[PDB]
From a paper:
The final model of Il‑DyP4 includes one protein monomer (residues 6–450), one heme molecule, one oxygen molecule and 431 water molecules. One heme with an iron is located between the two domains, namely the proximal N- and the distal C-terminal domain. Channel 1 has a length of 15.6 Å, and is located over the heme plane, which is the main channel leading from the protein surface to the heme distal cavity. Another heme access-channel, namely channel 2, from the protein surface leads to the heme propionate with a length of about 7.8 Å. In the heme active center, the side chains of Asp172, Arg335, Leu360 and Phe362 constructed a pocket structure which allows the conversion of H2O2 into H2O in the distal region of Il‑DyP4. Meanwhile, Il‑DyP4 also has a histidine (His312), coordinated to the heme iron as the fifth ligand at a distance of 2.2 Å, which is the same as another heme peroxidases. The conserved GXXDG motif in Il‑DyP4 is shown in Fig. 3b, which consisted of Gly169, Tyr170, Leu171, Asp172 and Gly173. However, the crystal structure of Il‑DyP4 showed that W264 is far away from the proximal conserved histidine residue (H312) (~ 10.4 Å). W380 is located in an extremely hydrophobic environment with five hydrophobic phenylalanines surrounding it, which might facilitate surface interactions between W380 and the substrates that are rich in aromatic moieties, such as dyes.
Numbering used by the authors: 58 to 508
Write the structure that this text describes.
Amino acid sequence: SLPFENIQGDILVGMKKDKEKFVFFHINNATAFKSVLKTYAPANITSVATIIGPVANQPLAFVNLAFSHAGFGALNVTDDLQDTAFSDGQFKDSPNLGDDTSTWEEAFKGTNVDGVFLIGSNDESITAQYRDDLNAKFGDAWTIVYDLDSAARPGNEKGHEHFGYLDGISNPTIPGFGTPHPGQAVVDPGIIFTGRSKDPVMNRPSWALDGSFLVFRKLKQLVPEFNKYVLDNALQNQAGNLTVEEGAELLGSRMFGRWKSGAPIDLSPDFDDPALGNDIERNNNFNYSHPGSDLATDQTRCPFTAHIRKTNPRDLEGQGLFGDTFHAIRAGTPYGPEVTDYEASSNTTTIDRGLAFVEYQSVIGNGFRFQQQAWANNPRFPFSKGPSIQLGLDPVIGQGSPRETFGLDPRNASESFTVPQVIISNGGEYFFSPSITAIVEKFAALEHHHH
Ligand code: HEM
């Protein structure tokens, strides 16, 4: 069993707070920075145990902390983690993601970002308080280079991302941690936590035990553009009696793999079933297999290129073509206000909004990076399908090539959809979230005891 009082809570369970502030910073004075850390971190870095334990022992805001490769250097900590993406930094790595850095937030366009504080609470007043407190204690020892507020959407769209789809449904868990939901992935702890069982870096340093790599991406979303696209390309059933609005929601469900309620189209392909989508016990219990259906050719229930089927090809893994290597935990939060009447009427975005995307994994190259580059951006993934069956890009997040996706029309797998870019990367950075002791014992090391 893992020491959940030593593991940063946002990795495994998520902060699950309505408001999440991301404080990206540069380190100006390592000695003064470590000094603050020595007392701040044991008092404020929120553990898994605190998040899942009694509400009585929870602070007003949860706080997590992660460092970039550049931050390691600024703290005189050797990067011996053996993660090539992490060491490169996301800006250098960005061509491999299909990013055009002309759309990046300026603060990310380099290696100036040394780390990030995650602050989760129920009111932006409290996250601002915790930020102000950090500013007061660090003083001139740091500079906040980017300060991003994210918030869960309001009302019955709480838990949904800005396109309207229920999010945070499918994430892996580990053996012995609570009860897995039907269809939920149960992966070896070393796929999420560095140094734990079946960590693919068998060489992993001891101090890194129970850390994880935090990938951050600011992903801007063009919601009216997306809505106008699916309306303009609305699908039809064989009966031919779908309205344009009904065919548009069908097409959206085919792009994602789920209806907006969360109902997986593999279980409910013809119409939304909001009771299914909302039910934790039903909404993830699928693997794309069906009696009488050829996994190699049948896209009538879910296109091979649907977002969730690109990023978690359950059928390929379930056939044993590979293992649980490529699962990772998402813990991001939507950012920006709701779509305004003007934006909707004009089919045009005027306000920045999107997803403050966070994904945790023991190997960046096996989680986020593989899901993006090897799968979403790969026009010949998934492999093992019929040799003439055209595939193309993930129609939600796929980039790097012409955004052509096949198989979205259930009546004609051959029909191509050229989907406008509705998600624009504003960049981010790769970080490492150490264990809580590692924060104090390594990153805040004030003396020079030899080892
Ligand atoms: C604004 C950007 C994005 C949006 C709106 C979005 C939306 C969604 C939605 C609605 C789901 C289904 C809910 C769920 O299964 O939990 C989902 C699942 C998922 N997404 Fe995304 N996503 C975005 C970016 C990304 C990126 C960049 C990656 C990885 C490179 C990714 C990987 C995944 C994974 C692994 C799942 C779970 C699939 C499964 O286990 O079946 N997403 N996403």
